[PDB]
Write a protein that binds this ligand. Structure first.
Ligand SMILES: CC(C)=CCC/C(C)=C/CC/C(C)=C/COP(=O)(O)OP(=O)(O)O
Ligand SMILES: CC(C)=CCC/C(C)=C/CC/C(C)=C/COP(=O)(O)OP(=O)(O)O
Ligand SMILES: CC(C)=CCC/C(C)=C/CC/C(C)=C/COP(=O)(O)OP(=O)(O)O
Ligand SMILES: [Mg+2]
Lengths: 298, 295, 290, 296
């Protein structure tokens, strides 16, 4: 089997995982309309708060639950969207956006509506400025949840450049910033643009590596680095995964080189130091998640 | 400074290397017009016959010198062409082609001409049928070391497919079959299509890895291409490509076995298949030691 | 030979162009700094381009667009004479001044022109004027300084997101006093991308000479199809006609699927004017030496 | 619906088409083993000899039939190959190569075997030199009828370059030379390198434009799908753009020929050859618009 190559990175889980997980899991169990009990247990088995804590292990203790709640509902909606047309799905999320902004009252009789409204009111309550910062990154994601993928010739370079702008990864980095109380300035963000793009790729390719078996097992719009590299080099998908994993390690090193350079230049501010560290854990965390999540299972 | 990942391919060196060296080196030395001592000394140090013996370790004892002579002159000619124009260089080789077929002038006053002529007559003398089988393969290679290029976008996939058809590597394979007495009819040789391409690709990329520094003296190479596509340094690119080369080696064995599993393997292709493996490992040791890639 | 193929897009020209042109020209020829160029300016038709791009701009707003572009051009042809370091700073020093967080040196035309200009825009419509800030900054930033395998498909996808094209749509919305929600805009992303491609390729076709005096559809198609640059321009021109057709099909679908709002209808029609106007101008201006 | 854009070329058919067709058709009707008479009906309907005279209108009267007979058997083998595996079809054609070279006697009880043998034996008789010359071009094509084409990401450029080396179009050019009696030297051929590549693309794209609907089976690899995807337009739009690109290649062919002449590099053989390619293009276009091979 695969067997990942050596990495100087390692997965870390948020100290309070057990605590938040119980809290968040409990809240959705009492508020979200799960159909049958079977589903009720699929949810707990999922451990969305445990996923969040794996991604943002360095989050502030009094903010990690916000991140867990946001991702939990987002994972939930993503599941429902699967069973509805691009039309209703798009209509479904557009209704939640003004409600998320808090510009429109929720229909207290619809779980998702008041869970979203309450959640964002809570966030603006704890930190208004930062809460309003993640608004667009979230809307961008939600909207993309229903965008139709365009099939076109794509080599490795083009695919990777495309993944560098993944809205999901952007959501993760912006959310991680909220969870960590890192109020980075426009000049600080631009300073780590390469780091972000680099990180974005690592995350997406690691996902491709463990999601391939399922992507193909879809009575198979196949768009993945595994298939692209396998065809370009003319080797098996397994061989492709191997090569790609080494590339990921090269991106891990590039991450260090860029961070090292950032410091030498005297541009590594206190916040940026915390930020790039966070991204390192997203990379190692996303790797563990990919190897274990049932989402990639068959 | 770049540690090659593990490989099951072990390179060999033809036992007669030092013997053929003296033979062939002596023939060219003082027979071929060397501008000066230095030239002659550098020529010996280059050891083209030694290069040839790394690539064709299983060549037949009474055929190895034929390969050593052929490549020695080609390396020489290739050296003189850089100083010529796409105009001059082309007429040069194009003139030798008829000669090589024995159809024309051997001009005894011109080294390159009587050497080419004499070399091919010797080959037809030893094995007529097989000496002809490689005429076109060599010509293809000669009518290429002067060709221009059509610049267009080329990604990793495009560059690799392109290298799978490298005329240089086809010449090597064709000359190996000659040197080994292997000839298996154009059938099953057609059956080792994938094997040949996979191999040609492996040889080309290993060359890219070691020739990047020097080539960077002014780029069509897998190193720069992967580096730009994955957005990493060229050193990181070489490391990744090396792993890819190990994947092609694994694929090579799979192709070999599969040929067997369905009853296609034959004494000819069995030997051929192994000979290619020696080119790949041989090429790797050469690429790591050749002054051709030195700054 | 470059005879434009048939197009169903008919360009429009703002009726106040003569009035606003002499108005906006007189200004720059009064503060901004060889009189031989002082003539090249009045003949450059900077406000005329503006009027072909936003022929439906509000009468009291058209002069704003003109002034903005007339300076973005004046600065552009100014970057051609300075290094990335020089230009990048030169431009970056104007952003805060544009926001109004830094006052301008009344002795430097480029500075106070920018200052007063943005001040007058906020004073006319602060909200909408603020919305143009970022789009303009993105454009200016890029003006300063990828290097990798780029084929025709990659290039066009890349042009679907061109900043300059983004700037025109933002400036157009402001000029027409068109308030559109991020929601309504989402519905027209395909139309926006399609339009961006059209604008860029027509520009590539006509600016090929100047640029060649590189990253351009003309050169790329020429290499991929192995034909001349001129042969390439002809093929691309026909591709532009297909994008025009697609625009109409998309506009028709937006309507049929009941997703069109009055503001959106005006928006998509305006994009058409930009496309056809851009073509008229590109063919006539001496900027690309007719 | 699809109006081809204006062109300075025009299709042209070989004069003896009628008689040659009768002559070559009857031959196969007597030797080729068609099961029932619905294949003989279809066969005759396909008129492979008229196809040949459309592609090689400038052929010599005494050679044009060698071309028709060769393409007829190649077309027929092509169809049979459809009802055979890769391993099978491969072995099948490989069996016929030594027979073509005249090295192995054919089995007189197997039509395809003796028909091939007799054909080359007859060709080598009329012009041993030129006959031997198109041996490799035919074998390259036959062996190509059975290999697999690994699918990989490919833009227009990559696709077009691959089509420039199309063994089928190569076979066409070589057969045209043999049929027109044009014995070109390597220098002359090296001189017409760009012109061949340009022509090859033209033929392939024109074929793509008309075989697209057909290729949409779904019960792949073509300029139509690739361009439509790269420019994000319909396949129908792609066709219109590709067609114009084809007219540019016709212009390029003329420019390349003019240049060749102006450089004093055009020989009588080459002049006749490049003109022969012009007719291969106009001819392949008409064929593409009319062949049942691309229908439903
Ligand atoms: C679903 C969701 C709310 C994502 C928000 C961002 C986030 C928490 C990302 C981490 C988990 C991940 C890689 C999901 C995408 O899997 P995948 O891309 O291999 O499968 P998919 O993208 O087709 O859903
Ligand atoms: C004389 C000659 C080269 C004959 C070809 C036969 C051949 C492939 C011999 C093996 C030596 C080799 C890998 C050369 C490639 O040099 P390179 O491609 O890395 O450097 P270059 O091609 O730019 O000269
Ligand atoms: C028997 C035979 C075909 C001989 C080849 C000689 C040749 C190129 C004849 C011209 C006719 C032609 C363009 C066929 C293309 O079929 P296609 O390529 O459009 O359809 P296909 O290749 O997928 O079968
Ligand atoms: Mg331009």
């Amino acid at each position: 089997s695969l067997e990942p190559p050596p990495s100087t990175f390692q997965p870390l889980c948020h100290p309070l995982v057990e605590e938040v997980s119980k809290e968040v899991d409990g809240y959705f169990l009492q508020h979200w309309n799960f159909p049958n009990e079977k589903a009720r247990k699929k949810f707990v088995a999922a451990g969305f708060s445990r996923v969040t804590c794996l991604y943002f292990p360095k989050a502030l203790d009094d903010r990690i639950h916000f991140a867990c709640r946001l991702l939990t509902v987002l994972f939930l909606i993503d599941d429902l969207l699967e069973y509805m047309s691009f039309e209703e799905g798009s209509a479904y999320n557009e209704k939640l956006i003004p409600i998320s902004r808090g510009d429109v009252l929720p229909d207290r009789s619809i779980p998702v509506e008041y869970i979203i409204y309450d959640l964002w009111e809570s966030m603006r309550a704890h930190d208004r400025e930062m809460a309003d910062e993640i608004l667009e990154p979230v809307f961008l994601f939600m909207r993309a949840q229903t965008d139709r993928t365009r099939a076109r010739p794509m080599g490795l370079g083009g695919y990777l450049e495309y993944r560098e702008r993944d809205v999901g990864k952007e959501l993760l980095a912006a959310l991680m910033r909220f969870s960590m109380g890192l109020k980075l300035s426009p000049s600080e963000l631009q300073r780590v643009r390469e780091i972000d793009a680099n990180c974005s790729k690592h995350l997406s390719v690691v996902n491709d590596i463990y999601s391939y078996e399922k992507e193909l097992y879809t009575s198979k719009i196949l768009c993945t680095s595994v298939q692209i590299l396998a065809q370009e080099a003319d080797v098996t998908a397994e061989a492709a995964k191997r090569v790609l994993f080494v590339m990921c390690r090269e991106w891990e090193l590039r991450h260090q080189l860029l961070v090292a350079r950032l410091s030498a230049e005297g541009l590594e501010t206190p916040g940026l130091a915390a930020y790039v560290e966070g991204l390192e854990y997203q990379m190692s965390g996303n790797e563990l998640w990919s190897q274990t999540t049932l989402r990639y299972s068959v």
